[PDB]
């Protein structure tokens, strides 16, 4: 049970330019689509670009260079004191030399760690997390930053066709948790455990095996060393079809609730924002992080028809309407991301000082 | 230090339709230079695609397929005995949903565990294996898939231009090295150590950070458990230029023989059969799997015009001419990568039984 600190984090999403816009976005369930990032242009000068060096680059690139600055800003370290250092880079993103994206990072900030991009469609951000935390875990990097990155070239209900693609980007920076608390920084959560796996062998693409979402979850929670009635909020998968659905939801009964009465939350950033593709898991991870900083859980849209053969009056799974302060259970929540690709992902974090967060520099922006 | 044993291999290489006839390529310093595989075809319906599937599909991935079907031969397991297993799958490789070179095999062999695609250049089949060790070290898998592939669209020496782009495939079966002692597998070596860093910030894109490739080294050796000495042969990055080839040598020598007068054999596939691109890395490796095993140094076929900046008669470093037996030292090998972008890599391996090979199945092949 290896305990990995989220020392730091920024992010931008449709109709959420920063954190607190997106933690207000959510916890007023809102929605931005009823799924584009209003982007003002960019500052290359002050990452020692060009603006023609600029103008050839990914888009995506640029607004990840301002995100990792932004989560630095947020963790209290100035960019001159994790220069050097033996820092990996993890981006879920879908490049357009295919590892720019992380490699970019690397070059501009000089860290020194294992430099990776991976695309696995909508689990990317959460499949470079695992990669940070084994990388965290056995002593390669001092620090990793996680990020996920899109910019584009109904669930649990009858109605679900499928989501908008939406744009987003999210960005971590993740110590170990000792390291953490003897240098006096921020811990807005700690991540306890993660896992990956892969469908295998599936009739075809949309076609979800329903023994690979329980054993991916039932691994996370294992190397978390938590009890599954511990974990109180779980952002699903939410395909937004509904025999996927069905499958997640039955999963995740037989795995959290098996012959279990206590509560379990279930919610979706996707009613709110749309489905940002590889950002998809890095938005799910910083609303539940943003959750358990905060104590509350915020209202879930839809579910508002329920899926045919699923008695949501036999099980303890439910859906928030409202903003409610923490239930009287622990402050552990979950994330899962179960990619048509065959890669699912499930992670489990935990809630719980004194470095400040830097203001943000202004940039001065244009196109 | 956490052992992981190679318990099966197969690759194709210029003038090396196979590992046996890439042995006696390189054991009797042949060049098949002075770059592409002799593919006749392929044989979609063994595994279960139409032609129509394979006409449209990357010829990487259907390589990727005969191959590792030929290391699950090699490992003397029938494809059943492995199918719906936590096997991981790590494939280092440039993509034409991309990570489609590893999803195919985890879907065709029905593969379970964590199925990613990395794209480092020349480093992508160690960072792989690099994945690979992390999750077979952290009990995600009991077992992975490690390959590098390309298929296209002088060194250490005063004549060095870089070399010809060749196509090359490696594919290794890795378990955990008790695990493997228990079920009687085949150990071809073992992997000691494998670290990945980055350079960080250069002043360009062929400029090397010499302080990040000794790290990067230093590093391997630690997780390794091994005394420096004990290192007896490296498998060079050679990059083939002056000043990247010179900081290569001495990096060598002040992290391998740093107040030693040990001798310290170098060499390079790359004079053999050129530059691999993503593959070089498993190119590298299965030569000095195959070194390891068969307990000999093989010629070194470049060299013969010594830099202008590095006396070769005052460091024990060395280039073996002939194929010799292994000299009176201790069976341990070394294998580094340092791409210009950013990512360097080396590995650590080691020398040292009843589960037969199978025959490969007789493919019928086609264009």
């Known amino acids: 049970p290896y305990d990995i600190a989220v020392v730091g984090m920024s992010g931008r999403?449709?109709?959420?330019?920063?954190?607190?816009?997106?933690?207000?976005?959510?916890?007023?369930?809102?929605?931005?689509?009823?799924?584009?990032?209003?982007?003002?242009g960019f500052d290359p000068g002050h990452f020692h670009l060009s603006d023609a060096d600029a103008a050839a680059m990914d888009p995506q690139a640029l607004l990840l260079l301002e995100e990792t600055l932004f989560a630095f800003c947020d963790a209290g370290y100035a960019p001159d004191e994790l220069k050097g250092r033996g820092i990996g880079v993890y981006v879920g993103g879908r490049s357009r030399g295919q590892n720019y994206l992380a490699a970019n990072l690397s070059h501009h900030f000089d860290l020194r760690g294992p430099s990776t991009?991976?695309?696995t469609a909508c689990s990317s951000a959460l499949v470079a997390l695992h990669h940070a935390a084994?990388?965290?875990?056995?002593?390669?990097?001092?620090?990793?930053?996680?990020?996920?990155?899109?910019?584009?070239?109904?669930v649990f209900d009858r109605r679900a066709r499928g989501f908008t693609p939406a744009e987003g980007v999210?960005?971590?920076?993740?110590?170990?948790?000792?390291?953490?608390?003897?240098?006096?920084?921020?811990?807005?959560?700690?991540?306890?455990?993660?896992?990956?796996?892969?469908?295998?062998?599936?009739?075809?693409?949309?076609t979800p095996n329903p023994a690979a979402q329980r054993g991916?979850?039932?691994?996370?929670?294992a190397k978390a060393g938590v009890a599954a009635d511990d974990v109180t909020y779980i952002e699903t998968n939410?395909?937004?079809?509904?025999?996927?659905?069905?499958?997640?939801?039955?999963?995740?009964?037989?795995?959290?609730?098996?012959?279990?009465?206590?509560?379990?939350?279930?919610?979706?950033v996707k009613p709110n924002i749309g489905h940002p593709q590889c950002a998809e898991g890095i938005a799910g991870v910083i609303k539940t992080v943003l959750m358990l900083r905060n104590r509350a859980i915020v209202p879930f849209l839809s579910g508002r028809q329920?899926?045919?053969?699923?008695?949501?009056?036999?099980?303890?799974?439910?859906?928030?309407?409202?903003?409610?302060?923490?239930?009287?259970?622990?402050?552990?929540?979950?994330?899962?991301?179960?990619?048509?690709?065959?890669?699912?992902?499930?992670?489990?974090?935990?809630?719980?000082?004194?470095?400040?967060?830097?203001?943000?520099?202004?940039?001065?922006?244009?196109?």
């Not at 659905?245 to 795995?255: M, Y």
Request: aromatic share 4%.
């Open 117 to 119: 991009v991976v695309d």
């Open 306 to 367: 329920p899926l045919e053969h699923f008695d949501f009056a036999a099980t303890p799974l439910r859906f928030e309407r409202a903003l409610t302060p923490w239930p009287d259970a622990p402050l552990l929540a979950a994330v899962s991301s179960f990619a048509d690709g065959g890669t699912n992902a499930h992670a489990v974090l935990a809630g719980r000082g004194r470095r400040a967060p830097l203001d943000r520099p202004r940039l001065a922006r244009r196109g």
């Open 13 to 40: 999403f449709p109709g959420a330019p920063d954190l607190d816009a997106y933690w207000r976005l959510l916890s007023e369930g809102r929605s931005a689509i009823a799924g584009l990032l209003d982007l003002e």
């Open 238 to 268: 939410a395909a937004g079809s509904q025999i996927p659905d069905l499958i997640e939801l039955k999963a995740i009964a037989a795995v959290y609730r098996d012959g279990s009465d206590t509560p379990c939350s279930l919610g979706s």
């Open 170 to 206: 999210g960005v971590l920076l993740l110590k170990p948790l000792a390291a953490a608390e003897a240098a006096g920084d921020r811990v807005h959560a700690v991540l306890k455990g993660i896992a990956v796996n892969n469908d295998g062998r599936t009739a075809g693409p949309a």
């Open 216 to 221: 991916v979850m039932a691994r996370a929670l």
């Open 134 to 154: 084994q990388a965290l875990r056995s002593g390669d990097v001092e620090a990793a930053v996680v990020a996920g990155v899109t910019l584009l070239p109904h």
